[PDB]
Amino acid sequence: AKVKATLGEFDLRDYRNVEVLKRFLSETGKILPRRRTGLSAKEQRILAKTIKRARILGLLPFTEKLVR
Amino acid sequence: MRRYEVNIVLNPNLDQSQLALEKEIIQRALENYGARVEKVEELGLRRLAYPIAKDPQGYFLWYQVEMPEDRVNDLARELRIRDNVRRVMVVKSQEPFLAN
Amino acid sequence: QVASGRAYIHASYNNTIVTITDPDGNPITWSSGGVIGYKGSRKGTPYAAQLAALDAAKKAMAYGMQSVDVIVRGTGAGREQAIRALQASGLQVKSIVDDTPVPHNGCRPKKKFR
Amino acid sequence: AVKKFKPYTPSRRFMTVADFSEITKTEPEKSLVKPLKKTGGRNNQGRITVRFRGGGHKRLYRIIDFKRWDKVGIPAKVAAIEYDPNRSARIALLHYVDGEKRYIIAPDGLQVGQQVVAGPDAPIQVGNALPLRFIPVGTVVHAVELEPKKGAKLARAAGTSAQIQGREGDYVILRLPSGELRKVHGECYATVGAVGNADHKNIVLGKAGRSRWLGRRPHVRGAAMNPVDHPHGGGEGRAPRGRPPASPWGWQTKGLKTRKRRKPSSRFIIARRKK
Amino acid sequence: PITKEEKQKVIQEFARFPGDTGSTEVQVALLTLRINRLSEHLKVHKKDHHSHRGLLMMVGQRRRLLRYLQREDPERYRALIEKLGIRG
RNA sequence: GUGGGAGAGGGUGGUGGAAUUCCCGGAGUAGCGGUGAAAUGCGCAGAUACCGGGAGGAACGCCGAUGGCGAAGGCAGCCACCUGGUCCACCCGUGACGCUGAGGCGCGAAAGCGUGGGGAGCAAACCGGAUUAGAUACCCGGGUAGUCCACGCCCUAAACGAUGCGCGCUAGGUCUCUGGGUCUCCUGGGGGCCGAAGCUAACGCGUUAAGCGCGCCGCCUGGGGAGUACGGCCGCAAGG
Ligand SMILES: [Mg+2]
Ligand SMILES: [Mg+2]
Ligand SMILES: [Mg+2]
Ligand SMILES: [Mg+2]
Ligand SMILES: [Mg+2]
Ligand SMILES: [Mg+2]
Ligand SMILES: [Mg+2]
Ligand SMILES: [Mg+2]
Ligand SMILES: [Mg+2]
Ligand SMILES: [Mg+2]
Ligand SMILES: [Mg+2]
Ligand SMILES: [Mg+2]
Ligand SMILES: [Mg+2]
Ligand SMILES: [Mg+2]
Ligand SMILES: [Mg+2]
Ligand SMILES: [Mg+2]
Ligand SMILES: [Mg+2]
Ligand SMILES: [Mg+2]
Ligand SMILES: [Mg+2]
Ligand SMILES: [Mg+2]
Ligand SMILES: [Mg+2]
Ligand SMILES: [Mg+2]
Ligand SMILES: [Mg+2]
Ligand SMILES: [Mg+2]
Ligand SMILES: [Mg+2]
Ligand SMILES: [Mg+2]
Ligand SMILES: [Mg+2]
Ligand SMILES: [Mg+2]
Ligand SMILES: [Mg+2]
Ligand SMILES: [Mg+2]
Ligand SMILES: [Mg+2]
Ligand SMILES: [Mg+2]
Ligand SMILES: [Mg+2]
Ligand SMILES: [Mg+2]
Ligand SMILES: [Mg+2]
Ligand SMILES: [Mg+2]
Ligand SMILES: [Mg+2]
Ligand SMILES: [Mg+2]
Ligand SMILES: [Mg+2]
Ligand SMILES: [Mg+2]
Ligand SMILES: [Mg+2]
Ligand SMILES: [Mg+2]
Ligand SMILES: [Mg+2]
Ligand SMILES: [Mg+2]
Ligand SMILES: [Mg+2]
Ligand SMILES: [Mg+2]
Ligand SMILES: [Mg+2]
Ligand SMILES: [Mg+2]
Ligand SMILES: [Mg+2]
Ligand SMILES: [Mg+2]
Ligand SMILES: [Mg+2]
Ligand SMILES: [Mg+2]
Ligand SMILES: [Mg+2]
Ligand SMILES: [Mg+2]
Ligand SMILES: [Mg+2]
Ligand SMILES: [Mg+2]
Ligand SMILES: [Mg+2]
Ligand SMILES: [Mg+2]
Ligand SMILES: [Mg+2]
Ligand SMILES: [Mg+2]
Ligand SMILES: [Mg+2]
Ligand SMILES: [Mg+2]
Ligand SMILES: [Mg+2]
Ligand SMILES: [Mg+2]
Ligand SMILES: [Mg+2]
Ligand SMILES: [Mg+2]
Ligand SMILES: [Mg+2]
Ligand SMILES: [Mg+2]
Ligand SMILES: [Mg+2]
Ligand SMILES: [Mg+2]
Ligand SMILES: [Mg+2]
Ligand SMILES: [Mg+2]
Ligand SMILES: [Mg+2]
Ligand SMILES: [Mg+2]
Ligand SMILES: [Mg+2]
Ligand SMILES: [Mg+2]
Ligand SMILES: [Mg+2]
Ligand SMILES: [Mg+2]
Ligand SMILES: [Mg+2]
């Protein structure tokens, strides 16, 4: 169920792309590992390094509670 | 001159009039600093991932610009001066990096 | 008297504290390992935590509570047993969520956590 | 900066002097000075009522503007920065476009040749004056009034600054130079920025004579006196205090609080100071 | 940074023959350019020790060429360092 | 030179949230805390646990990696400015301009020192409680320097790869990071593992040599006494 597949063309720099990006954050809000996002080394850097921005502007969470 | 993307969030709970005023302060400020507006996109409110100034929602702005390198810092300071502006974040505009 | 509320379980290595509150977040009653009659190390055991959550809910059901949402903090032994106790208590347990504090590398810990 | 001397005399070895770099005018503006009545620390009865005062340099008193809401909306240029013997801080000569001239105490960062203005509408930049309510919460400020139109009373000494903390109805919340947390009325004017000459405290007077120039005569210890003169008086040889350390007048002098408890301004002080 | 344009003028005013990039002349001149800017950068940023090494390398670099240039044509050596204002 | 690239490389200025602490309002009751078990301690003068408000400082969770960068020490939220090294492709420019390096000069973790700030957490010294024959310790409750910021000192280390720099030559397999191509794969440059030949007292090294060779430098000459003494230079002192 690797996330990269379940999406088409996307830009790893558009930090306002909240709807797309919000998949790359686990159920608990944490940035997902390369073993789940399917991104290569080089790409996961741009992925994270933008996700952080999107949090700052208020569009992504820093953390979430965990419901069972 | 270089290309940047001014992002700004405002007090969501204003009237439409005062809202324009802050933009009037903003727009006059951009001009005072030699900013040149290119694209510009105004999405307004958006449900926030977390409260900013204890407020679940917030009004957005955004303008791609062209202005001098040395002046962006001094501008953001001036951009942040109003008690209603709540976040400013100028990012160097860079070409899209694509997957798939 | 209130219908719905919340249950807070502070479950640590040394003790398990259970507090039931109202909707706005105000405590109604509390109980814990000490309250039910243990001292020392016994305060923290799962059986101890059980008596706590039960006595806590017993006290809470006295004032009219029926349905709560359970809030969990801490990686205690008597955490999971306390969770049991509340569901089996006579209460409705609408939902269970873990809001344990985790720092993003903040204050230097005591030497025992290094 | 602070200027040292080579140890060519025993007293020069430690003595340090102010750097005076910010000064551009070595003469006070005549139409703003008046003579200082030296008192020697003696009152209208002629009695010393503040011991050990007198014999310092002569001084011309510079008339300072501690109001500023006096001239709202009229800007002024900073013509010079001058030495004022009556304070720690430096002073700024303003030429109003009004033509009128005034002094204010000089903030840090002020430039010779820049402009400043006072009022509800002033930009929040160094040297401007506004009622406290219109200064953004968190910016540091000086020359603060204590009650509206009563004059700037707080943060006036070199290097000092007060800082706005938050608001509560008609009142704003200041952290004073001492760290005390106080409510001040929002109509109290204040000037954005801190006072300059912050290097002031690092000045080493250097010898007895310097203090003398400052009009400060020698202070004699209680322990060096006789019982008639002082609680610590007398004893054969040196002596410890032998009672709680006391003033010449007998009150306890290590620790004992003296603020009047029932003082009406108590409703306005949130937290007494620190350190 | 230094810009493309700003740099060309240097390349253009020092080239030995019409097409020249990177003769000792141009080489030194290009180096003298980044040196004098870094010097001014360190004048403000006194705590940028890492970039000082860069400077010391460039200063070192320009030095070794000047020795080369001064060795082959002395007349030409003194000519370049006058237009660049260099000795001390 | 031209054209591109990756990066916690360095300096300045800002700014985001998580958490700890203290303060304030609420609501609430008989315990909380801590250990192997305990005590000290805190708590009806209302603690803990929970909700709201506020203050301040320090460090940046997930990403994060057997990863990246730097000459070394070392460098990790994010944003802008200023700046260094370095790789790649084109094969365009100069024409041996190179290598090394006694002295010199600069950089240099922590602790430490000077003047001034700052001080939430942590914590030498110190106090108290336990343990014990004793416990000037290990464990628990407190706690000051300091840890943070600016400027100026100190210059040490298991400052390590215990491996000086540069160049050339001597099988390959595989994993990874980062450029470029004719994108199976080929070619460069870094980071690991196993291995040809060879080296090694052995362990192990092996195109990142500890192999075969050249250049220049630093260093060793039985253990202790001793990194001591004396002299000398450096430092505020510690001390180098
Ligand atoms: Mg604001
Ligand atoms: Mg316990
Ligand atoms: Mg402690
Ligand atoms: Mg000065
Ligand atoms: Mg001196
Ligand atoms: Mg002198
Ligand atoms: Mg001198
Ligand atoms: Mg003498
Ligand atoms: Mg002397
Ligand atoms: Mg002075
Ligand atoms: Mg002086
Ligand atoms: Mg001065
Ligand atoms: Mg007169
Ligand atoms: Mg007078
Ligand atoms: Mg009289
Ligand atoms: Mg009389
Ligand atoms: Mg007196
Ligand atoms: Mg007197
Ligand atoms: Mg003065
Ligand atoms: Mg002094
Ligand atoms: Mg005097
Ligand atoms: Mg005195
Ligand atoms: Mg005396
Ligand atoms: Mg005496
Ligand atoms: Mg006597
Ligand atoms: Mg008498
Ligand atoms: Mg008497
Ligand atoms: Mg007496
Ligand atoms: Mg006596
Ligand atoms: Mg006598
Ligand atoms: Mg005596
Ligand atoms: Mg006698
Ligand atoms: Mg005597
Ligand atoms: Mg005696
Ligand atoms: Mg005596
Ligand atoms: Mg004596
Ligand atoms: Mg006596
Ligand atoms: Mg005494
Ligand atoms: Mg006595
Ligand atoms: Mg006595
Ligand atoms: Mg008053
Ligand atoms: Mg170079
Ligand atoms: Mg030369
Ligand atoms: Mg309370
Ligand atoms: Mg009572
Ligand atoms: Mg709270
Ligand atoms: Mg490297
Ligand atoms: Mg060629
Ligand atoms: Mg040397
Ligand atoms: Mg050091
Ligand atoms: Mg240190
Ligand atoms: Mg000491
Ligand atoms: Mg210190
Ligand atoms: Mg101090
Ligand atoms: Mg003890
Ligand atoms: Mg004992
Ligand atoms: Mg002890
Ligand atoms: Mg301890
Ligand atoms: Mg000290
Ligand atoms: Mg220290
Ligand atoms: Mg190592
Ligand atoms: Mg190495
Ligand atoms: Mg060694
Ligand atoms: Mg050895
Ligand atoms: Mg060497
Ligand atoms: Mg060798
Ligand atoms: Mg490749
Ligand atoms: Mg490629
Ligand atoms: Mg390789
Ligand atoms: Mg590595
Ligand atoms: Mg091997
Ligand atoms: Mg073999
Ligand atoms: Mg290989
Ligand atoms: Mg060997
Ligand atoms: Mg011998
Ligand atoms: Mg020997
Ligand atoms: Mg020695
Ligand atoms: Mg030693
Ligand atoms: Mg000696």
From Swiss-Prot, chain A:
The protein's name: Small ribosomal subunit protein bS18
Known role: Located on the back of the platform of the 30S subunit where it stabilizes the close packing of several RNA helices of the 16S rRNA. Forms part of the Shine-Dalgarno cleft in the 70S ribosome, where it probably interacts with the Shine-Dalgarno helix.
Keyword annotations from UniProtKB, A to Z: Ribonucleoprotein, Ribosomal protein, RNA-binding, rRNA-binding
Record-level Gene Ontology MF annotations: small ribosomal subunit rRNA binding; structural constituent of ribosome
Record bears the keyword Ribonucleoprotein: yes
Similarity annotation: Belongs to the bacterial ribosomal protein bS18 family.
Species annotation: Thermus thermophilus (strain ATCC 27634 / DSM 579 / HB8)
Single GO BP term: translation
Included range, full protein: 20 to 87 of 88
Cellular component per GO, a single term: ribosome
Subunit structure: Part of the 30S ribosomal subunit. Forms a tight heterodimer with protein bS6, also interacts with protein uS11. Binds to the C-terminus of IF3 and to the central section of Era.
UniProtKB/Swiss-Prot annotation, chain B:
Subunit field text: Part of the 30S ribosomal subunit. Forms a tight heterodimer with protein bS18. May make transient contacts with protein uL2 of the 50S subunit during translation.
SUPFAM superfamilies associated with the record: Ribosomal protein S6
Function of the protein: Located on the outer edge of the platform on the body of the 30S subunit.
GO cellular component: cytoplasm; ribonucleoprotein complex; ribosome
A UniProt-annotated Pfam family: Ribosomal_S6
Family: Belongs to the bacterial ribosomal protein bS6 family.
Sorted UniProt keywords: Ribonucleoprotein, Ribosomal protein, RNA-binding, rRNA-binding
Database matches in NCBIfam families: S6
InterPro entries xrefs: Ribosomal_bS6, Ribosomal_bS6_CS, Ribosomal_bS6_sf, Ribosomal_S6_plastid/chlpt, Transl_elong_EF1B/ribsomal_bS6
HAMAP family: Ribosomal_bS6 (MF_00360)
CDD domains: bS6
Gene name for this UniProt entry: rpsF
This protein's name: Small ribosomal subunit protein bS6
GO molecular function: small ribosomal subunit rRNA binding; structural constituent of ribosome
GO aspect biological process, one term: translation
Key word Lipid biosynthesis present: no
Swiss-Prot record, chain C:
NCBIfam families per the UniProt record, alphabetical: PRK05309.1, uS11_bact
One family name in Pfam for this protein: Ribosomal_S11
Protein name: Small ribosomal subunit protein uS11
One GO term describing the cellular component: ribosome
Function text: Located on the upper part of the platform of the 30S subunit, where it bridges several disparate RNA helices of the 16S rRNA. Forms part of the Shine-Dalgarno cleft in the 70S ribosome, where it interacts both with the Shine-Dalgarno helix and mRNA.
Gene Ontology BP annotations: translation
Biased segments, Basic residues type: 107-114
Keyword annotations: Ribonucleoprotein, Ribosomal protein, RNA-binding, rRNA-binding
Highest taxon of the lineage: Bacteria
Gene Ontology terms for molecular function: rRNA binding; structural constituent of ribosome
Region (Disordered): 97-114
Assembly mode: Part of the 30S ribosomal subunit. Interacts with proteins S7 and S18. Binds to the C-terminus of IF-3; however exactly how IF-3 interacts with the 30S subunit is unclear. May contact the C-terminus of Era.
Coiled-coil annotated spans: none
Taxonomic placement: Bacteria, Thermotogati, Deinococcota, Deinococci, Thermales
Family in the record: Belongs to the universal ribosomal protein uS11 family.
Entry-linked PROSITE patterns: RIBOSOMAL_S11 (PS00054)
Curated annotation (Swiss-Prot), chain D:
Physiological role: One of the primary rRNA binding proteins. Required for association of the 30S and 50S subunits to form the 70S ribosome, for tRNA binding and peptide bond formation. It has been suggested to have peptidyltransferase activity; this is somewhat controversial. Makes several contacts with the 16S rRNA (forming bridge B7b) in the 70S ribosome.
Stored PROSITE patterns: RIBOSOMAL_L2
Biased composition (Basic residues): 256-275
GO biological process: cytoplasmic translation
Any one cellular-component term (Gene Ontology): large ribosomal subunit
Keywords: Ribonucleoprotein, Ribosomal protein, RNA-binding, rRNA-binding
Annotated protein name in UniProt: Large ribosomal subunit protein uL2
Gene3D superfamilies listed in its UniProt record: 2.30.30.30, Nucleic acid-binding proteins, Ribosomal protein L2, domain 3
Subunit-level organization: Part of the 50S ribosomal subunit. Forms a bridge to the 30S subunit in the 70S ribosome, contacting the 16S rRNA. May also make transient contacts with protein S6 during translation in the 70S ribosome.
Segments of this protein annotated with the region Disordered: 222-275
Compositional bias of kind Basic and acidic residues: 229-239
HAMAP family in the record: Ribosomal_uL2_B
Source organism: Thermus thermophilus (strain ATCC 27634 / DSM 579 / HB8)
Top-level taxonomic group: Bacteria
UniProt family annotation: Belongs to the universal ribosomal protein uL2 family.
InterPro entries reported in the protein's UniProt record: NA-bd_OB-fold, Rib_uL2_dom2, Ribosomal_uL2, Ribosomal_uL2_bac/org-type, Ribosomal_uL2_C, Ribosomal_uL2_CS, Ribosomal_uL2_dom3, Ribosomal_uL2_RNA-bd_dom
